[PDB]
């Protein structure tokens, strides 16, 4: 019948109580799983929220059991990291015609950008020509934009790759897809494997290859899984590498911007930084140089979450201000301001947020008097402003801005990073009662910019902002257990997550879940056989433009009613969330 092949590969909903015994749980990609830790994330008070996420973040460094999946510290993973370091050296010693591309969609693209710059800086601080570049799906504007649709073409990945790679004779392509999912990266990897004379592909994500996506990609013939499997075969002869430790589920299910993005920086900062440090010394990069770096990042989690109490407070404030229809400002310097901007933008697609709700500023790129003349005017009693900087920053700029903002609102807070024994100028201190200062131990360091200190700081801020933005929205009641039910379907991945979420919460067959989702999407059009057989992109393109699709679908299924009926009931409920929970009892 129509739609049987489109949906053939969706696993059937199990019968009640047998989610485990059917083998269904074992098939959920680690990156899509419900993290047992956060099953009641929707009931946790702010303090618990910080704790539960700091703990989800911790799983990044948790060791492999004695049967189960390789992790970061597993010997097979570290070996792979060393051999890739190795290949990145060959290219470092031959910089004419050599290039290193970091590539992904969404937050994977954003991570790739930050790291391309950092390592380009390093090469320059040492007077050598920069060999790094990045690619992000949808081009360079995607870096600071919510543009979830752009990851779904393999040809557009290959195109961007052929662009930045022309003329070059040795290119290392680091494709980053947390879920081993993005067609944008899959095409790059396959192109690489078709021309190894020039290309060395390296795939980075956090599922076993047996859980890589196996869906048809609409402009292409292999699936991400086949690609990743061909890469794996090639690794024995060292012409492709798959670097894919399990780090455990996200605290918020499928929100791969969180642990996935952090583990991405962790994993590649470590490996690339080792690669540089050790070319100098004329030594093979070793499992032990990586280890040093890895353990440092691991201390960095402990140091960051030492400050948990004031992380929770900042959260409580961010939430209150969102709850009163107010807005949130994340102001910060150099690289930390970027991260601030990446985080606010990600709340748009993650939580259904207006871009003003949580937004970031680099000193988007609106600097001193400009910020004070444009943004400063229109503030309010109820708004929250966060200042994010290090004690190596233009602290004059800082205190100026804090001052004027002080008058507009009281809900300021700061995130301040120091080397131990640095101190706050006291006009800055008195301006923040409960300041969040993270003081870093002294560490020995090879290079001028002290890159290992940037990496620590960037990561620690990422964790703080991710945890704040995410738990603020959970406090508002927007999250259902540990799932974001009411997401906007803007790509094929998100279509499949919507469907799976409808199987999970309704408990009903796949045939019905699919029907109810396609009806909610395409309403007022009825389900014809064309619609049933359409490619997934046609569903996406229509769902992208609507509201509450997935809750309308769930209601229809829970009441056994039409879309007309479920819509009227959702309109008669106090809120989306109230209606859904209600129906679920
Ligand atoms: C936990 C919950 C709600 O049950 C859930 C959430 C999301 N996905 C699943 C799930 C369960 C079983 C298999 C698959 C397969 C998934 C899906 N693969 S697919 O697109 O080729 C196929 C069309 C579904 C997928 C997706 Cl959507 C993202 N990443 C990976 N690696 C992945 F395999 S998600 C998923 C389960
Ligand atoms: O890295 P992946 O698995 O290919 O995911 C790439 C993008 O879908 C993903 O980063 C998305 O933008 C984030 O909002 C997830 O929280």
From Swiss-Prot:
GO BP terms, alphabetized: carbohydrate derivative metabolic process; intracellular glucose homeostasis; negative regulation of glucokinase activity; protein import into nucleus; protein localization to nucleus; response to fructose; response to glucose; triglyceride homeostasis
Outcome of substituting residue 425 to L: Protective factor against diabetes type 2; correlated with high triglyceride levels and low fasting plasma glucose levels; the mutant protein is less efficiently regulated by physiological concentrations of fructose-6 phosphate
Chain ranges of the SIS domain: 88-284, 318-478
Location in the cell: Cytoplasm; Nucleus; Mitochondrion
Reported impact of residue 392 to A: Impairs inhibition of glucokinase
Region (Essential for interaction with GCK): 442-444
Binding residues for beta-D-fructose 1-phosphate: 107-108, 151, 177-179, 346, 493
Expression across tissues: Found in liver and pancreas. Not detected in muscle, brain, heart, thymus, intestine, uterus, adipose tissue, kidney, adrenal, lung or spleen.
GO cellular component: cytoplasm; cytosol; mitochondrion; nucleoplasm
UniProt xrefs under InterPro entries: GKRP_SIS_2, Glucokinase_regulatory_CS, MURQ/GCKR, SIS_dom, SIS_dom_sf
One Pfam entry name: GKRP_SIS_2
Positions annotated to bind beta-D-fructose 6-phosphate: 107-108, 177-179, 493
Broad class of the protein's primary localization: cytoplasm
One GO molecular-function entry: glucose sensor activity
Region (Important for interaction with GCK), start-end ranges: 197-198
Protein's job: Regulates glucokinase (GCK) by forming an inactive complex with this enzyme. Acts by promoting GCK recruitment to the nucleus, possibly to provide a reserve of GCK that can be quickly released in the cytoplasm after a meal. The affinity of GCKR for GCK is modulated by fructose metabolites: GCKR with bound fructose 6-phosphate has increased affinity for GCK, while GCKR with bound fructose 1-phosphate has strongly decreased affinity for GCK and does not inhibit GCK activity.
Family of this protein: Belongs to the GCKR family.
Annotated domain remarks: Fructose 1-phosphate and fructose 6-phosphate compete for the same binding site.
Assembly behavior: Interacts (fructose 6-phosphate bound form) with GCK.
Name this protein carries in UniProt: Glucokinase regulatory protein
Organism: Homo sapiens
Gene (name only): GCKR
